[PDB]
Amino acid sequence: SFFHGVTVTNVDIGARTIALPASSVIGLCDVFTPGAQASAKPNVPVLLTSKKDAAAAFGIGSSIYLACEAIYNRAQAVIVAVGVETAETPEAQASAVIGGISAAGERTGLQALLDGKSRFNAQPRLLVAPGHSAQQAVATAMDGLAEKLRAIAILDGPNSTDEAAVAYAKNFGSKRLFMVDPGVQVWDSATNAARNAPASAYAAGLFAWTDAEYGFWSSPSNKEIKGVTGTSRPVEFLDGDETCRANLLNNANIATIIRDDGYRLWGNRTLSSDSKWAFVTRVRTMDLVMDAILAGHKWAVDRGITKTYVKDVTEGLRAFMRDLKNQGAVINFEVYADPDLNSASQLAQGKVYWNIRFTDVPPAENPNFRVEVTDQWLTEVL
Amino acid sequence: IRDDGYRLWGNRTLSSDSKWAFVTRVRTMDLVMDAILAGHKWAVDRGITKTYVKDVTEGLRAFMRDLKNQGAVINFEVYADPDLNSASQLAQGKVYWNIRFTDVPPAENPNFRVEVTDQWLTEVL
Amino acid sequence: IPQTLTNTNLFIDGVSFAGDVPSLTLPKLAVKTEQYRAGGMDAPVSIDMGLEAMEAKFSTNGARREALNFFGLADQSAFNGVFRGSFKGQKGASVPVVATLRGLLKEVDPGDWKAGEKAEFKYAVAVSYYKLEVDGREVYEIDPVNGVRAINGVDQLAGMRNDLGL
Amino acid sequence: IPQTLTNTNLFIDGVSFAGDVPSLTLPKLAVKTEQYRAGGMDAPVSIDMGLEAMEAKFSTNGARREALNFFGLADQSAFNGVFRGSFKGQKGASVPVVATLRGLLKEVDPGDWKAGEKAEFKYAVAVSYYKLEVDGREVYEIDPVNGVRAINGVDQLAGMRNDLGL
Amino acid sequence: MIPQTLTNTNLFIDGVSFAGDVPSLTLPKLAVKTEQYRAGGMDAPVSIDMGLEAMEAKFSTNGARREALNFFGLADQSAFNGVFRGSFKGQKGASVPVVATLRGLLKEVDPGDWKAGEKAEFKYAVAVSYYKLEVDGREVYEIDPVNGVRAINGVDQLAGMRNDL
Amino acid sequence: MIPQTLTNTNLFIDGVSFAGDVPSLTLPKLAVKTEQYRAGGMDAPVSIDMGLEAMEAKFSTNGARREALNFFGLADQSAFNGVFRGSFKGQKGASVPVVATLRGLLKEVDPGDWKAGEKAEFKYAVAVSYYKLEVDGREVYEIDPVNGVRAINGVDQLAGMRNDL
Amino acid sequence: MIPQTLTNTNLFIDGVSFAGDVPSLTLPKLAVKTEQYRAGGMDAPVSIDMGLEAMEAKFSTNGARREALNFFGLADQSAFNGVFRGSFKGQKGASVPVVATLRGLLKEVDPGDWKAGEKAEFKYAVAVSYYKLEVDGREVYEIDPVNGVRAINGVDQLAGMRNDL
Amino acid sequence: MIPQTLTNTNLFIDGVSFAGDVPSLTLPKLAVKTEQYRAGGMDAPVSIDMGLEAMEAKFSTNGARREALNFFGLADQSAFNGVFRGSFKGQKGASVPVVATLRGLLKEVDPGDWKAGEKAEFKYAVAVSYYKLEVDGREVYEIDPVNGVRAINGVDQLAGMRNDL
Amino acid sequence: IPQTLTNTNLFIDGVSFAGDVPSLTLPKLAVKTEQYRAGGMDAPVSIDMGLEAMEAKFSTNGARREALNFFGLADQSAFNGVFRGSFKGQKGASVPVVATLRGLLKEVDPGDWKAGEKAEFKYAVAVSYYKLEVDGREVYEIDPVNGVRAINGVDQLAGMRNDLGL
């Protein structure tokens, strides 16, 4: 049938915070229970828009939604979220969250995040698996999937002390990994107690937040976190070059949480053995000025090389870089065609080369204030 | 509905076809055509020149853009039928156009999703 | 390929002017630029302020009474009109340029009648609706009433009509 | 059919100017457009504000005393006047264009008398009443006194005269 | 910041659109009522936030609009509402909808000089009793004269004055 | 709404028509007398509907019209009547008769600068004691100063003020 | 009515004619002194016929005219008389003699800026103590300030005010 | 001295740059409050340094800048800061950075006539509660109204008034 | 060595106009001088006030639809454009003059269509970005957005950007 006239219903909806900047996308993977209310097959990806379809695709009490509510508390981005069936032994659970080509012609586990584009038109640049990143074998599969996807993979640590978190970060150093060791404990309204969230979704919702108005060039290393209480372990920054718990963990290239009740994030540097790719900003800027160029250059591939083909795109690379200088993404650049690698033999196989040498803003991780108490303006008091 | 014959209440005709349910779609299809067929007392028994089809399909558009101006329709398209128009149809006076348009649906069901929250209770302090 | 005008034509109500119109002029579509130089820049940047007033001249060297009876009547935008032009090109086949121009007839200027020269009745159309077509497909569609300034199919004022509640 | 002016003529009081008037000019009928751009539109739309001031030049290369005695006299619209023009066409028979122009004689401008050239007395008529006829039937009738601006028989100001109580 | 500016405008009165009528607007001049505070010891007089001035929103119309002339001098205030809209285009085409929902009383109607050839103008004036400016979608101003809510950027500034005392 | 505007005008004084005389009009400025109400607690002063201002209708004449100069300073008020008419054409030719029947007292006559070559002007002014504006055929304003009937859109607004008290 | 307007003017001072001198005139601004009467019950203030304002007739002269400069500041009022004349031609040549016989006191003489190349002007002003306007041959205005005869169209309006009381 | 003049300008509000927005500035008019002292014996009245006038800094913006409209009428004074910058080029290219750091309260916002084709302007006004002008790198003015420090060329002039008494 | 223009060309999006553009015009780069005469000098000295508004005409004698589809669209500075010109010289080898001109398309002015003459569609570009190159190396780079007015490599507004905090 149908209805004529006004039919006043009575529903339960939350705040109207659904305003969506389509800037950063997050690849997520955690366990859940495929019930009747969870309308999502296990190993397939599901694009998420808000909490209303994160509660429709997966259940309320599922470990997806506990790791997906934390993202939408801070930034209302869009999430390419894959699920995984839970397992009994932790080795089979670690093998299932990785997944692979063990289906007929599909990708399971983390590998289904590689199907972000051509299914959803959202290639994930933020890779998280909260709780599972503390395992070594999952984080290595989290590692190798980031270089295939040009993404920042946010890792975890154990619940234990600082020594067992530094030792977890020594075997890494592969320029794409961002470790946050302190277990963020958070209040919930279901059981009226304090949970223990494994710190990934809060940093994932913070990387997607700082791209909305501060841009991808900016550092998310002193930003606020909403929907949060204290950490599992205290960690503070003090001064005087002592055994600070923050400085011991920054020197191991691990992010912490500093002020009261989960108030800030603290890490600038990736797990990188190379000194050039230390900061998170240089790794993100090199990965996010290119999709800002390769989109906008869906052309200049399979077109056909004319005489001024090279010139008409190297004046289009400059025009799509001068606006990056205008919005403060880069400091002064240079874009020019490569004179010696471009040759007539390379044109017959479609290969053409450019040089897009630029520089980026360094994040001010250390503002030093040299200060004394003089007695110079004491003659002002007379 | 209301007191002492205060309102009328029906949107839908007696129609077994689901397309022609509302009274508005049946009236709009019947009352945009006499708004066109008047104003086109010409374009019948005139004589088909070379640009005869073009000069009236630009006159059907001009008598439809004012219907969009007064809110009668939402966005339309008026174009001559390319495959039905032929040289054999001109010898018997038959010429065809396509006046595919859409109409405003009457809001028979405004739903208001409403609850009493306790969100702005900290405003009372 | 080099391409140049060869022939023109003018229709009003289907009333052809085959050998009657020597000259005709499409409206100068000019966008309303204002030289904007604020702080932090040395040169002015021009900015859109909508279009200018469209203005269409055409001419006839004889009294036709089909172009004269549309002057100054109370129904504005009653002069419907079609400007046609065939652009030939070097390699044979031509490209038709069809423009329809629904506005009021602004002025009728019969020049000097010097008894042995051409009559040359100047006309001018204050264009309300304008739609330029090249090679049978749409290029322009200019109607400020409802604001539907459209370039090659897409509507450029679709942003402001959601902003102004239109 | 191609059609062009061949001969002109000028009558005032039935006083013919058969071989006397080299050039004559009908008034430029221009409607008073004002570029109206309100909110919700990108381009201006021109609008009627009545007509402009009609102005009729004619010329004579000799002192005739029938065109000179109507200058500046106290009875405005005493110069009655008839502008005639025969438009021949290609296929033989012509189309007469007759305009009567009842206004005041605005100026008389005798040019430079250079002793071996033509005299060329410029005249100008400030037209009050104007009525253009093509092929023996009425095209225009312009008289602002009583407001009877009429195009091909029908009166375009019939709406406003009921509005203004005229 | 990219250069933006006004390109087109619009106006609503009680739902209906003046989509071909209004040549001019004036949003109400938001002005704080300043009292010159110079005292003993201090050199220059400071100006103090001590309430807003009288808001008044002019708008103009070239034709006899019955919808605009209906709301002059009604016995109930805030029967006139009115919605003023603008569109600021930017340099890259990103048009920004500036909408200003006021709810004042219509104050003044003067059809000016009705010359014959010259177009006529109906200047209007609105004694504004409520004002609400929105730049893109976010609420910048929300001025309640009769209520104690002067919301600048969504937070009430008059409520913060009561917590300080 | 189609764009409309003034194209031509007319003027009647006691029946006779000034069909070739008047270059200018001014309908009386309808303006409500506002008193600034700011009080304890409220931030901005509101303006209150508290009566209309002085209506005054200028009109102008280029020649010595005995019919217009007859009604200056008569011992009886509302001996002058006057009818001001306009015609607003629209975009599709639908002309709209704006007629304003006033019945005031003629207030001021100043033949200005009688320069030789320049045309002369007789500015007039009418102390309006009755005003009635009609947009198309329907009565929009009907202002009785001396009576208690201020009719906006045909309904009396002063009568509604007495029912509220 | 046929369109008429001023074409030429003239001026007499005590009989002699300024037939090549005066570039400008100003007949005195006839204006009634209005008192705003709003009261209990009535909405808009009416204006009441309560006497005329100060009449003052400017005229101007480009040369040193001894006949005009003779009458400044004389010990007797109405020693200056002056007669201002106009001619309104019509559309059919029917010229209409507008003659205004005033009998005031000459009030102000200011020879203005005597620049070298620029022509000089002697502005005059007349404190009008009697005014009498005639449009064609018939007497329209006859303003006695000092007497109780304000004749509009030949009938005294001040005499009708005494019969009403 | 080589001829110098303004070529370009800039404006900061709370850190962010209006690098494509502002067409106009006005630094606050520094004016001393003068009292006319003429007395017995002395001929002409002298003017005495007796405090400064009200400083007020206008600036203008063509677009809806949320950063500028955020600071109107806040409950705390000196929440608005603002930094006005100029660049004076000289004849030999030696550009001189004139920077004026003020810290006033934003006083007035009037979006003016929103005509359709014409660009819009948002005039601003700042009730200046602190002013500091620097010509090249050196501090010329430093005006504390609320404090007793009026520093001209880096030395306090109000402190020198206390040592004289 | 005497050197003169021989051939011109015009690219927009790589879309060549080989035999299509008869005339094209680079923008008149004019600095904004104001005649400054203060005390102590008899003659005025002109002073820099930034540049004027750059303005680029080009023309096409046929309807191409690649130059028409960039008029008046909402993205200002979407007309990218390349003006090319080969300056030959007396002694053989030529010098290329390449200018890229990223601005909005200001106006499209189709002239009089007189049925036997050239079409001559006037165009005009309101130049935002301008970069003139002579002999493969940079001469000018004019962009008021970020203020990067550069002469032969060095940036002349580098002084003011440190002054304005840019």
CA-closest candidate to residue B81, choices B119, B43, B53? B53
Q: Which residues of B touch C (CB under 8 A)?
A: 49, 51-52, 55, 58-59, 62, 65, 68-69
Q: Judging by DSSP bridges, how do beta strands A25-32 and A126-128 pair with one another?
A: parallel
CB I161 within 8 A of CB H10: no
d(CA E134, CA A142): 44
Closest CA in chain B for residue C77: B62
The full DSSP string for B12-44 is: B-S-SSSTT-BHHHHHHHHHTTHHHHSS-SSSS
d(CA H65, CA H59): 13
d(CA D54, CA D29): 6
d(CA E30, CA A333): 45
CA-closest candidate to residue A354, choices A367, A366, A373, A341? A341
Chain D interface, mutation test: which of C12, C71, C117, C118, most D Cβ atoms within 10 Å? Answer: C71
**What is the distance in angstroms between the Cα of F69 and the nearest Cα belonging to chain D?**
22
C77 vs F91: CB contact, 8 Å cut-off?
A: yes
Can you say whether the dihedral through the CA atoms of A313, A315, A316, A321 is positive or negative? positive
Paired with E105 in beta bridges are: E127
A and F touch per CB criterion (3+ pairs under 8 A): no
CB C63 within 8 A of CB C21: no
CA-closest candidate to residue F5, choices D147, E58, E67, D46? D46
D166 vs F17: CB contact, 8 Å cut-off?
A: yes
Q: Judging by DSSP bridges, how do beta strands D121-134 and D45-47 pair with one another?
A: unpaired
I63 vs C95: CB contact, 8 Å cut-off?
A: yes
D41 vs E8: CB contact, 8 Å cut-off?
A: yes
3-state secondary structure at position I86? strand
Residue in the structure block whose two tokens are 């039935």: D14
Tell me if A170 is assigned to some domain: yes
- C-alpha distances out from residue B91 to B41, B86, C14, E72, Å: 21, 9, 20, 64
Q: Which residues of A touch B (CB under 8 A)?
A: 2-13, 15
3-state secondary structure at position A57? helix
B and A touch per CB criterion (3+ pairs under 8 A): yes
Is the domain of A293 the same as that of A231?
no
D23: left (phi over 0), alpha (psi -120 to 50) or beta: beta
d(CA C45, CA C38): 9
CB H3 within 8 A of CB H88: no
d(CA I71, CA C132): 12
Q: Which residues of E103-142 are buried (b: 16+ CB within 10 A; e: fewer)?
A: bbbbbbbebbebebebbbbbbbbbbbbbbbbbbeeeebbb
Using a CB-CB distance cutoff of 8 angstroms, which residues of chain I are in contact with residue E92?
A: 75-77
Closest CA in chain B for residue A7: B111
Q: What is the greatest pairwise CA distance in chain I?
A: 64
Q: Collect all residues with Cβ–Cβ distance below 8 Å to F89 and sequence separation of at least 6.
A: C74, D47, D48, D159, D160, F4, F5, F7, F95, F96
Tell me if A205 is assigned to some domain: yes
Question: Could you tell me the two tokens for A161?
Answer: 């002390």
d(CA D156, CA D134): 19
Question: Could you tell me the two tokens for I58?
Answer: 């080009």
Question: Could you tell me the two tokens for I78?
Answer: 């979407």
Q: Judging by DSSP bridges, how do beta strands E56-61 and E122-127 pair with one another?
A: antiparallel
C and G touch per CB criterion (3+ pairs under 8 A): no
- C-alpha distances out from residue D10 to A12, A201, D63, D86, Å: 90, 95, 15, 12
Using a CB-CB distance cutoff of 8 angstroms, which residues of chain A are in contact with residue B7?
A: none
d(CA A140, CA D62): 109
d(CA D161, CA F19): 11
Instruction: For residue F15, count other CB atoms closer than 10 A to its CB.
Output: 8
Instruction: For residue F78, count other CB atoms closer than 10 A to its CB.
Output: 14
G and B touch per CB criterion (3+ pairs under 8 A): no
CA H19 to the chain's CA centroid: 19
3-state secondary structure at position A65? helix
Which of H9, H83, H89 is facing I48, going by the closest CB pair? H89
- C-alpha distances out from residue C151 to B62, C99, C155, D44, H117, Å: 19, 14, 6, 18, 21
d(CA I95, CA E21): 57
**What is the distance in angstroms between the Cα of G137 and the nearest Cα belonging to chain D?**
21
Chains that touch G (3 or more CB pairs under 8 A): D, F
Q: What is the greatest pairwise CA distance in chain A?
A: 91
Using a CB-CB distance cutoff of 8 angstroms, which residues of chain H are in contact with residue I162?
A: 97
Chains that touch C (3 or more CB pairs under 8 A): B, D, E, F, H, I
CA A361 to the chain's CA centroid: 19
Using a CB-CB distance cutoff of 8 angstroms, which residues of chain C are in contact with residue H21?
A: 38-39
**What is the distance in angstroms between the Cα of I117 and the nearest Cα belonging to chain C?**
7
With 0-12 / 13-18 / 19 or more C-beta atoms within 10 angstroms meaning exposed / middle / buried, residue G101 is middle
Which of A312, A319, A326 is facing I14, going by the closest CB pair? A312
CA-closest candidate to residue I26, choices I47, I48, I46, I5? I5
Angle formed by the axes of helices A136-147 and A90-98, nearest 10° = 0
B and I touch per CB criterion (3+ pairs under 8 A): no
- Tell me which amino acid residue G63 is: G
Which of D74, D77, D145 is facing G89, going by the closest CB pair? D74
**What is the distance in angstroms between the Cα of D55 and the nearest Cα belonging to chain C?**
11
Q: Collect all residues with Cβ–Cβ distance below 8 Å to A57 and sequence separation of at least 6.
A: A38, A39, A40, A46, A48, A64, A81
Domain interval for residue A333: 274-362
**What is the distance in angstroms between the Cα of D39 and the nearest Cα belonging to chain H?**
6
Tell me which H or E stretch contains F162: helix F157-163
Q: Which residues of A316-354 are buried (b: 16+ CB within 10 A; e: fewer)?
A: bbbbebbebbbeebbeebebeeeeeeeeeeeeeeeebeb
CA-closest candidate to residue D63, choices D108, D11, D112? D108
Chains that touch H (3 or more CB pairs under 8 A): C, D, E, I
CB F4 within 8 A of CB F97: no
The full DSSP string for G47-72 is: E----B---EEEEEESS--HHHHTTB
**What is the distance in angstroms between the Cα of B7 and the nearest Cα belonging to chain A?**
12
* DSSP class of A208: H
Which of C45, C48, C145 is facing E7, going by the closest CB pair? C48
Q: What is the greatest pairwise CA distance in chain E?
A: 64
d(CA F155, CA F106): 29
3-state secondary structure at position A47? strand
Is the domain of A36 the same as that of A99?
yes
> E strands within A59-164?
78-85, 126-128, 152-155
d(CA I18, CA A156): 61
Using a CB-CB distance cutoff of 8 angstroms, which residues of chain C are in contact with residue D7?
A: 115
Which of I11, I102, I146 is facing A308, going by the closest CB pair? I11
With 0-12 / 13-18 / 19 or more C-beta atoms within 10 angstroms meaning exposed / middle / buried, residue H155 is exposed
3-state secondary structure at position A205? helix
- Residue F44: what are its φ and ψ, rounded to 5°? -100, 145
State which approach was used to obtain the coordinates: cryo-EM
With 0-12 / 13-18 / 19 or more C-beta atoms within 10 angstroms meaning exposed / middle / buried, residue A154 is buried
I14 vs A309: CB contact, 8 Å cut-off?
A: yes
CA-closest candidate to residue H55, choices H148, H160, H125, H151? H125
Q: Which residues of C22-50 are buried (b: 16+ CB within 10 A; e: fewer)?
A: bbbbbbbbbbbbbebbbbbbbbbbbbbbb
Chain C interface, mutation test: which of H10, H16, H60, most C Cβ atoms within 10 Å? Answer: H10
CA I156 to the chain's CA centroid: 19
With DSSP H G I counted as helix, E B as strand and the rest as coil, what are the percentages for chain G, rounded to 5?
5, 40, 55
CA B40 to the chain's CA centroid: 18
* Cα angle I109-I115-I121, degrees, rounded to a multiple of 5: 20
Q: Resolution of this PDB entry, in A?
A: 3.5
Chain B interface, mutation test: which of A1, A8, A52, most B Cβ atoms within 10 Å? Answer: A8
Q: How many helices (H) and strands (E) are present in chain F, helices listed first?
A: 2, 15
Closest CA in chain C for residue D51: C72
**What is the distance in angstroms between the Cα of D23 and the nearest Cα belonging to chain C?**
4
d(CA H90, CA H2): 6
Paired with D31 in beta bridges are: D51
H20 vs C41: CB contact, 8 Å cut-off?
A: yes
H65 vs E3: CB contact, 8 Å cut-off?
A: no
Is the domain of A269 the same as that of A317?
no
- C-alpha distances out from residue I64 to G122, H46, I21, I58, I99, Å: 70, 77, 10, 13, 22
Closest CA in chain C for residue E15: C165
Residue that finishes a domain, picked among A215, A249, A273? A273
Count the domains in chain A: 2
CA-closest candidate to residue F61, choices F23, F100, F106, F115? F23
Is the domain of A247 the same as that of A291?
no
F and D touch per CB criterion (3+ pairs under 8 A): yes
d(CA E72, CA E94): 37
Using a CB-CB distance cutoff of 8 angstroms, which residues of chain F are in contact with residue G152?
A: 70, 72-74
Using a CB-CB distance cutoff of 8 angstroms, which residues of chain C are in contact with residue B65?
A: 129, 143, 146
Which of E3, E87, E93 is facing C163, going by the closest CB pair? E87
Tell me if A192 is assigned to some domain: yes
Q: Collect all residues with Cβ–Cβ distance below 8 Å to D55 and sequence separation of at least 6.
A: D27, D28, D106, D124, D125, D126, D127
Using a CB-CB distance cutoff of 8 angstroms, which residues of chain F are in contact with residue C75?
A: 92-93
Is the domain of A250 the same as that of A280?
no
CB E27 within 8 A of CB E100: yes
Locate all alpha helices (DSSP H) within A158-290, ordered by sequence.
163-169, 200-210, 245-250, 280-288
Which of D38, D146, D164 is facing F10, going by the closest CB pair? D164
Using a CB-CB distance cutoff of 8 angstroms, which residues of chain B are in contact with residue A2?
A: 109
Closest CA in chain E for residue H111: E27
CA-closest candidate to residue A35, choices A83, A78, A99, A72? A83
Question: Could you tell me the two tokens for A368?
Answer: 């030093």
d(CA H46, CA H37): 5
Paired with G130 in beta bridges are: none
